[PDB]
Write a protein that binds this ligand. Structure first.
Ligand SMILES: Cn1nc(CSc2ccc(Cl)cc2)cc1O
Length: 133
């Protein structure tokens, strides 16, 4: 019910430090270049307890479906095989991905009419701002 503020179709309007985030994650040069060019839409829906987040771009369409607090396997757009858990903490969707003894966290929050996505890998944060399509 509260997760309703996230539901809809969103379009990327700005990005900061995404290349640096991808470097910290271990993404190679060619994938960074093509992924960094993408202007994805993010489509979020809910059906009962199941949340679906789709990312659609010229680089790589992805779709994850999950229940809050319940681990799932995810193949990321850059082809990492990760174990993911997504929870809703104080109104923020918090997505933790674990692989090869590493961890990254993606937070999605509503701020004004934006959906702000913060991606953190060690000390490196990328901020990506989406608005309604
Ligand atoms: C935060 N984020 N992630 C994507 C998918 S593309 C992607 C590429 C490389 C990495 Cl490391 C993560 C994601 C699009 C977007 O706004």
């Amino acid at each position: 019910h509260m997760c309703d503020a996230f539901v809809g179709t969103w379009k990327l309007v700005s990005s900061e430090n995404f290349d640096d985030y991808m470097k910290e994650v271990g993404v190679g040069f060619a994938t960074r270049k093509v992924a960094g060019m993408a202007k994805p839409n993010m489509i979020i829906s809910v059906n009962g307890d199941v949340i679906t987040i789709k990312s659609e771009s010229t680089f790589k369409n992805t779709e994850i479906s999950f229940i809050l607090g319940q681990e799932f396997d995810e193949v990321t757009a850059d082809d990492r095989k990760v174990k993911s858990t997504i929870t809703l903490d104080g109104g923020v969707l918090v997505h933790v991905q674990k692989w090869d003894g590493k961890s990254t966290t993606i937070k999605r929050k509503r701020e004004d009419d934006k959906l702000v996505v913060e991606c953190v890998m060690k000390g490196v944060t990328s901020t990506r701002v989406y608005e309604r399509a």
